[PDB]
Design an enzyme around this catalytic site. Structure first.
Site, PDB file in Angstrom:
ATOM      1  N   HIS A  63       0.838  -1.229   0.000  1.00 11.50           N
ATOM      2  CA  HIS A  63       0.000   0.000   0.000  1.00 11.50           C
ATOM      3  C   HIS A  63       0.880   1.289   0.000  1.00 11.50           C
ATOM      4  CE1 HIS A  63      -2.834  -3.003   1.170  1.00 11.50           C
ATOM      5  NE2 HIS A  63      -2.296  -3.140   2.370  1.00 11.50           N
ATOM      6  N   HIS A  93       5.340   6.655   6.185  1.00 12.45           N
ATOM      7  CA  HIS A  93       5.010   6.208   4.799  1.00 12.45           C
ATOM      8  C   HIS A  93       4.637   7.390   3.937  1.00 12.45           C
ATOM      9  CE1 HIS A  93       1.205   6.325   6.958  1.00 12.45           C
ATOM     10  NE2 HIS A  93       0.729   6.734   5.780  1.00 12.45           N
ATOM     11  N   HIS A  95       2.016   8.824   0.460  1.00 14.11           N
ATOM     12  CA  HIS A  95       0.924   8.677  -0.509  1.00 14.11           C
ATOM     13  C   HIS A  95       1.174   9.511  -1.766  1.00 14.11           C
ATOM     14  CE1 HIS A  95      -1.687   6.765   2.541  1.00 14.11           C
ATOM     15  NE2 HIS A  95      -1.096   7.610   3.364  1.00 14.11           N
ATOM     16  N   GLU A 105      -3.284  13.475   0.235  1.00 17.88           N
ATOM     17  CA  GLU A 105      -4.569  13.045   0.848  1.00 17.88           C
ATOM     18  C   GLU A 105      -5.411  14.235   1.294  1.00 17.88           C
ATOM     19  OE1 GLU A 105      -3.889   9.574   3.365  1.00 17.88           O
ATOM     20  OE2 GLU A 105      -4.416   8.535   1.530  1.00 17.88           O
ATOM     21  N   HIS A 118       3.437  10.850   5.807  1.00 21.09           N
ATOM     22  CA  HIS A 118       2.793  10.700   7.067  1.00 21.09           C
ATOM     23  C   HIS A 118       3.755  10.064   8.066  1.00 21.09           C
ATOM     24  CE1 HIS A 118      -1.487  10.605   5.094  1.00 21.09           C
ATOM     25  NE2 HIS A 118      -1.057  11.837   5.270  1.00 21.09           N
ATOM     26  N   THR A 198      -6.279   6.767   7.252  1.00 20.30           N
ATOM     27  CA  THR A 198      -6.736   6.961   5.864  1.00 20.30           C
ATOM     28  C   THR A 198      -6.732   5.689   5.113  1.00 20.30           C
ATOM     29  OG1 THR A 198      -4.579   7.581   4.810  1.00 20.30           O
ATOM     30  CG2 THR A 198      -5.935   9.370   5.969  1.00 20.30           C
ATOM     31  N   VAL A 199      -6.418   4.608   5.822  1.00 20.46           N
ATOM     32  CA  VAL A 199      -6.383   3.285   5.197  1.00 20.46           C
ATOM     33  C   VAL A 199      -7.256   2.370   6.107  1.00 20.46           C
ATOM     34  CG1 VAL A 199      -3.989   3.429   3.971  1.00 20.46           C
ATOM     35  CG2 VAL A 199      -4.188   2.438   6.337  1.00 20.46           C
TER      36      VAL A 199
END
Ligand SMILES: NS(=O)(=O)c1c(F)c(F)c(S(=O)(=O)CCO)c(F)c1F
Ligand SMILES: [Zn+2]
Length: 260
Positions: A63, A93, A95, A105, A118, A198-199
């Protein structure tokens, strides 16, 4: 469902099927409308103590990449701002989207950024473990940093140098002596609101601290994260070209600013 992702049949719009909190009242990310945001003088200074020897591994979760940190000590902790007590660094991590024009995000007055970093922390003052803290309203604190297309960020090299070795979901490699501090922008002005992962499982356990000032990433650097796979060795290869969730409605929540 153990097979959520960002592809057509498992992507954000389908997550509500197995995680109905997706349509919750404290879902993240959000749009930040600055004219509605109030400065809060009760916010304490943000305090960021990060030790580079805390970093242990980088891996491909399928992810994103995840940098994991040794979190049984308080060597790397986030305090201050909106937080009560010490939140221990757990992981980092990123995005991004399939193209440079969007992929953050959070979206600020309609503006999206190329990517969003993040930094996940958990309240070790109250909870025994990250896993437990993830289930508590005050359990987690995540610092978000926007990345805008700009001249290359030398501070991303440690990470980008590893991406080939973690191409496949499940791969991991030794990753220490990581200067996380230098990845932050000079100014730490931020907005803050109560939200979620958010996941999946989208738990409403996160104090969000979203920095106003973006850092830079080149288009060349960013393209490298898109050749990560969301698939494991021996599974039909699919690329992780986009891994961002759309902003979710505020539903009555108010975003505060550290600054005026
Ligand atoms: N986008 S987010 O910051 O909400 C986020 C993640 F994406 C994320 F993968 C993790 S996790 O630590 O890897 C496992 C719990 O989900 C998180 F802990 C986490 F907070
Ligand atoms: Zn994230």
């Amino acid at each position: 469902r153990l097979s959520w992702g960002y592809r057509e049949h498992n992507g954000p719009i389908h997550w509500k099927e197995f995680f109905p909190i997706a349509d919750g009242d404290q879902q993240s990310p959000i749009e930040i409308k600055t004219k509605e945001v109030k400065y809060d003088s009760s916010l304490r200074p943000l305090s960021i103590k990060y030790d580079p020897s805390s970093a242990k591994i980088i891996s491909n979760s399928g992810h994103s990449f995840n940098v994991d940190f040794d979190d049984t000590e308080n060597k790397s902790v986030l305090r201050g701002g909106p937080l009560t007590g010490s939140y221990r660094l757990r992981q980092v991590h990123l995005h991004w989207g399939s193209a440079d024009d969007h992929g953050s995000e959070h979206i600020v007055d309609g503006v999206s950024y190329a990517a969003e970093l993040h930094v996940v922390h958990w309240n070790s003052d109250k909870y025994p473990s990250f896993v437990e803290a993830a289930h508590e309203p005050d359990g987690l604190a995540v610092l978000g940093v926007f990345l805008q297309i700009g001249e290359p960020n030398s501070q991303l090299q440690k990470i980008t140098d590893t991406l080939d070795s973690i191409k496949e979901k499940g791969k991991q490699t030794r990753f220490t002596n990581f200067d996380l501090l230098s990845l932050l922008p000079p100014s730490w002005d931020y907005w803050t609101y109560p939200g979620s992962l958010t996941v999946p499982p989208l738990l409403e356990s996160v104090t969000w601290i979203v920095l106003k000032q973006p850092i830079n990433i080149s288009s060349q650097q960013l393209a490298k994260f898109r050749s990560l796979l969301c698939t494991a060795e021996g599974e039909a290869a699919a690329f992780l070209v986009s891994n961002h969730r759309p902003p979710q409605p505020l539903k009555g929540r108010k975003v505060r600013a550290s600054f005026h």
